[PDB]
């Protein structure tokens, strides 16, 4: 009936191998060609079994957590689109991976910061009002989900569900920034800004720094951490398999069509920005860009065409809606895989909240 | 305030850590250990005692694996606190136990669809046939045990052994009815545990032969693999943790210790795996009795010996204070353990007090 594309158990900056996805779908009716080398390394290639109308549901990935627990990791954006496919077509799918959390750590000295035993960073923000020595702890940016196809060698993007920016070490306040989505190919899919932490990788750019995440046509690799942090104690918070920019004391940027810009300096309260999502004019945007993802991304492909209601208002409070956002509300409430499977009802509660503040409301 | 904390060095599963993994774990700390590369000492951390003094060695075993449901509470690992008089330049061999493999979540889509509750092939197995032998897989891995032992003329001598809890079963709806087991005499021979389809635990000195059962410390304390029939179709890998843990199948295997944990003969999705038997040697004093507290891997804390969520602890601190003969046990546990002194480990401290009340010593 449906095909679900996951990260095949791969986590971090580099993606799955062929054997990882072989084990991830062994007795399942799903087979993919995983690239062994080149820039298509870690991208799953899937053959369509019919020439029908499909509904590709792309879900980005979350950013990392800071050295504290006073933050919820910036959730990954969702983009649902209905597309027309022809039998035996090749769908190149990059299931973006989660940006690395700062905690828990295998290093005793860093784990001491994670539980509260070490206070060197708080001391530096108190005696010098800035972090220049004890860098690190800002979670790495999350990776975006890239669903695209190849047109005479050059790749054409279909859906790009952006990945969330990593959280900063001393982050406290929650995000106010809306979800950015693009429909025109006239604007370029450039990489995000990189300062101390790395910025997210775009759709097509030229990555120069190690800590900044790479673009998709560049192989889409999670950026490294800043050297100050790896040199002082080795607090590696690398970005995710999409455009995930690795994070220093500031959170790294997330990936997307346009990468999420990271903090220009080493501000321990500055989180990384989420990426910019993308929908192709060759398809139609089913539901707008909404952050919902808790961990790794995923891609759902299916053929196009009572007590559970009271449960959702307990999770999400009184949500102001517009008679315009009713169309989007219905398609979301009854036809997505989040608002139907009870285990993913926690996702649906998130989806609605962001639909209330949405720009198309 | 100086203390030496031995962890798992980031290793997991039936095989322990390497020397580089531990140098990476104790990178910028005043701790450095020697980890073996082959043989029986593969994964064990050798530690040179820095001075001649009376130390408190707190050994914590490793928890067991979850069941064939994501919403399953795991069998916690046993904690043993002891005071030992140690000499300078004494080589302390410390094995930090590793938790057993969880059944949920899992990368395989078929296995994962069982963990969320939509696929019910296991529930149909008992309806068609009386005995479950085809849809094997769903249990929890046996938690590894934590050993702290010295070497006398090349023969190993134990000091502290904190048993690891055996993993839980697929349909583990009801809880168990047994307390912690502790041995205090070397006369009692520490042998391997009883193994059925899901392997049993691992003892201190034994001659293990079953591949699905955990191995003893004299053999290497390698975790036991899962039963072959569970790898037949979907390949539900649920191996026991490093330290003598047992593979789980569907019922869940037992953890290790001085004496290996017990496992059932028939694949029952309700019966869990019995945890191992802890050990404290006669030369050291027992500070507090054995209590199940660890939620993940084990650990060891050595230190020089002297002499909002707080409300969830006060429900237990009330009666324990003046009710039994173990009032001092509660006081020293609440004021001297790093579970109760560090505010982040409050949950661990909550499991301590709870287990002090149910224990037959009180």
Swiss-Prot record, chain B:
Cysteine-cysteine disulfides: 9-22, 104-115, 227-249
Disorder noted: A chromosomal aberration involving ALK is found in a form of non-Hodgkin lymphoma. Translocation t(2;5)(p23;q35) with NPM1. The resulting chimeric NPM1-ALK protein homodimerize and the kinase becomes constitutively activated. The constitutively active fusion proteins are responsible for 5-10% of non-Hodgkin lymphomas. A chromosomal aberration involving ALK is associated with inflammatory myofibroblastic tumors (IMTs). Translocation t(2;11)(p23;p15) with CARS; translocation t(2;4)(p23;q21) with SEC31A.
Effect the entry attributes to changing residue 198 to S: In an ovarian serous carcinoma sample; somatic mutation
Protein name, per record: ALK tyrosine kinase receptor
Function of the protein: Neuronal receptor tyrosine kinase that is essentially and transiently expressed in specific regions of the central and peripheral nervous systems and plays an important role in the genesis and differentiation of the nervous system. Also acts as a key thinness protein involved in the resistance to weight gain: in hypothalamic neurons, controls energy expenditure acting as a negative regulator of white adipose tissue lipolysis and sympathetic tone to fine-tune energy homeostasis.
Domain notes: The EGF-like region drives the cytokine specificity for ALKAL2.
Subcellular location: Cell membrane
Family: Belongs to the protein kinase superfamily. Tyr protein kinase family. Insulin receptor subfamily.
Tissue: Expressed in brain and CNS. Also expressed in the small intestine and testis, but not in normal lymphoid cells.
Organism name: Homo sapiens (Human)
Effect of residue 180 to A: Slightly decreased autophosphorylation. Decreased autophosphorylation and subsequent activation
PTM remark: Phosphorylated at tyrosine residues by autocatalysis, which activates kinase activity. In cells not stimulated by a ligand, receptor protein tyrosine phosphatase beta and zeta complex (PTPRB/PTPRZ1) dephosphorylates ALK at the sites in ALK that are undergoing autophosphorylation through autoactivation. N-glycosylated.
Upper taxonomic lineage: Eukaryota, Metazoa, Chordata, Craniata, Vertebrata
Residues represented out of the complete protein: 680 to 986 of 1620
Glycosylation site list: 30, 129, 184-185, 207, 307
Assembly description: Homodimer; homodimerizes following heparin- and ligand-binding. Interacts with CBL, IRS1, PIK3R1 and PLCG1. Interacts with FRS2 and SHC1. Interacts with PTN and MDK.
